Symmetry: C3
Subunit: 331 residues, 3 copies
Amino acid sequence: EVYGIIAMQAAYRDYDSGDAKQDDNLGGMQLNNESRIGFRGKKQFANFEPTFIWQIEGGYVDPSFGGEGAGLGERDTFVGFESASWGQVRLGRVLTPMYELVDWPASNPGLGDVYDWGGAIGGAKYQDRQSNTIRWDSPMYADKFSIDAAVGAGDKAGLGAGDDYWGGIAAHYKLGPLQLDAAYEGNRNIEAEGQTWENNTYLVGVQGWFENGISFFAQYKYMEADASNGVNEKQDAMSAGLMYTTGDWQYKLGYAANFDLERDGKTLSNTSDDVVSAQIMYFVDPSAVLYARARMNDFNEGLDGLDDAARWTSGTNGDYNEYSVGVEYYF
Amino acid sequence: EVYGIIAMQAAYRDYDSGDAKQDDNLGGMQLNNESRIGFRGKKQFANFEPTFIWQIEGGYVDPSFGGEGAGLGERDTFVGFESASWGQVRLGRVLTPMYELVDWPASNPGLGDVYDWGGAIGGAKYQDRQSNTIRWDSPMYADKFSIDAAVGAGDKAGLGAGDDYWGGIAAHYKLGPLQLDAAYEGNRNIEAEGQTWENNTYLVGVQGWFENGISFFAQYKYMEADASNGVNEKQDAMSAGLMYTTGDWQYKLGYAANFDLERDGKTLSNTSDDVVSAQIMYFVDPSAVLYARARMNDFNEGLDGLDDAARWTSGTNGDYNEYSVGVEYYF
Amino acid sequence: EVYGIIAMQAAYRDYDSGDAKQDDNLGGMQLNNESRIGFRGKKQFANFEPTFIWQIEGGYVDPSFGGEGAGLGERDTFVGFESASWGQVRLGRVLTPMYELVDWPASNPGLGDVYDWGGAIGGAKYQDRQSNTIRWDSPMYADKFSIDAAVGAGDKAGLGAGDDYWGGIAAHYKLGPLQLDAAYEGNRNIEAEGQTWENNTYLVGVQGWFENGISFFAQYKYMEADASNGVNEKQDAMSAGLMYTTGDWQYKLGYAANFDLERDGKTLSNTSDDVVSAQIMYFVDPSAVLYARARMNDFNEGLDGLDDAARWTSGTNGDYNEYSVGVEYYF
Ligand code: NA
Ligand code: NA
Ligand code: NA
Ligand code: NA
Ligand code: NA
Ligand code: NA
């Protein structure tokens, strides 16, 4: 099968970095073309009861702040087997059970700079899409609850330049109109800032859809990290959104926040992020959306890592506001 | 739909750069695999009268002087809407209204080294295929007159490293067997040579097709550029071609030349390029052509920019002659 | 048409390099996703008797020791003409006549580090898949005899950075259940280690398939090399495999070895490699296989080139063992 998401976003960014040239560069209007082509298949092997499944999805063909061009396999790309009895196992490049919940519902609309890859923790809060990963997805037992479980090699291990690995698990529970989410991920042998780290991230969350037209999601994230030199860091974050859908319209208010990081017992002042976002979406077709979105990002003021050099965050480049329109079509 | 152009060229180059090792290096026989695969589609949204359109085109799969492999989106890749009433709007990566006329017909056959990206002017004479763009194509009003018009982000802005932008417009008028072309492009906030430039380019041209089998095109290009330190540059260029089409064959003669550059009123000596080109083409199928090509490029001898360092031109590598055989098939 | 090979390998590698961190980095468990998507077609031109053919095959989508993402055109990608009388000609990216035999049958299962790209000789033993190649494949005359013949530009030459080139020829003769193979390749103008090399490689081999289910292959590879400073190098290599195919299973035992490199008549001690490999295969479907494989690589302990710095070989990273299971699906 050929499949694709044709998706373009026109976005104006006004930056407030404290330098006018830096404000001018990062800022301006760009087109964020997240269109992608994928190939997929299912296949019943003659001599194996579980059905063979496979997918190869390409990258964004021209995202903003980046050059043109994507290859096949840049996004979720795997082989695997699936069964009605025990769910599906997948090998290759997938979302980690923890990341999947961070991305959806928790990173939309436009909350990703804070809640996705934002944050000041050292090491690796979690992995997002990772190659060399095996992920088991359980069925929806009793039409109520599901389990996601994965282990994989780390970013350096997949280039033969390290021994990092990671494991994660997530569970979902249906409670009438609500879904309770809980997820966990641990990263080991993470080499950065001249140390070897261990990360542990925990997430709990709720999403609800109700027949009156209101839907909401709410998540709490607690990320801990310990270095080989004995320093321990802790960071909190949360994300929530409110949506009222009436006819062909969806109103959404989104908010997320990273809180001040705690290092070895000290609160580092001004290491917190938060973003507030509003989005109005029009269901222009059963297979497409049009949308307008506004967001305000207030990022942290900086922090150094355990090598006495600045630690990169989504706040490095500066505070900014974004006004965007976009379209997404699925085939 | 899937579409593609299968295009292979066997080309011999004899260089005259003034160094024999480099003449041996750059010269020789190479294959120019300009093949590309694309996907495109249209869709009628239920709640939007204009027809939705999109295209994702890949790069040359193995061009000469480069490595193998191309990504999806390296070429014309966009979304847009269409109306029979007001034409079509496209957001994404498109040819600029001026570049389209520079490329076709004015760069064929093999005049591109001189007329396309050749030249000595500073800044950016024009953009060619440019990402982060909106381009409107008007209908052929009265089956005679059409407008092509676009505004877009610059090369640096699409990486968040500048605030360069550009606007462009082109118009075509049908006069019996003639089409009159006139185009313009202006680039602003272009950073190069330690300065910030503004470019303004103008083009006029005529192409004609006659029932006896004669066709020709002729273009005149005028590029001026102003740097922030007050230096002003001006350069003229021209391109013309003559073809006699008889039966399954087309004979072609091409010429293009860039003239000496003018900086602050001073003519820079020997900064002019020109190419004479001959091509025989065989219509091997309604969907394919074979061609043979001979081409002679005489390039400028060099110029320094306003940073007292050499300015790169298509003449950097040296004068050269080229003999080509090739095939192009459309599906 | 679209075609593909969906191929994933889970492999544990135990290195024995003489450094513990290097054993930690290079070794471990990884996923080797050698999946690829391809496009190919044929066309009968109205005015040309031989049929036009073309192919664009993509790279490995997320191989081991590498990052994710592959372009269209990284593998066999060509245009060409084919006729029942005279076979087929191909221009573009293809395997050299010699390389095809080194790869198949002689590199399976897991003999590639030694017999494929392994060895200690200087210059370029052979090309494998190389762009800018014209390769002719003759018909199977009398269902007994076939020829493969190719000439091409070299790896530096395809970037406008050299004048290396190469030509090669191979032939196969079917004798009942045996096939006698002979191949040759000569590379010229190879710039490496501060000299200019000439390599000449010769190959002979036999393949057998018997009605009882036994198949075998065995090849003898002889590599010669001469540098511009007068140095002469010689290396011999060999590969063999034994197979029993019964029902849904095929057992494979493979061995290959490079012998000690001889430079200027003097044998360099411990410049020899060898690999032993066993693989058990399950034909899970007419279109797929599952397999388990174990292999042990013993590589040479080091070698200097003609610039007195280490010459890179397949052993530079260290000895290792590998245990892997995998799946392959064809569509
Ligand atoms: Na699940
Ligand atoms: Na090339
Ligand atoms: Na450009
Ligand atoms: Na137009
Ligand atoms: Na090569
Ligand atoms: Na053959």
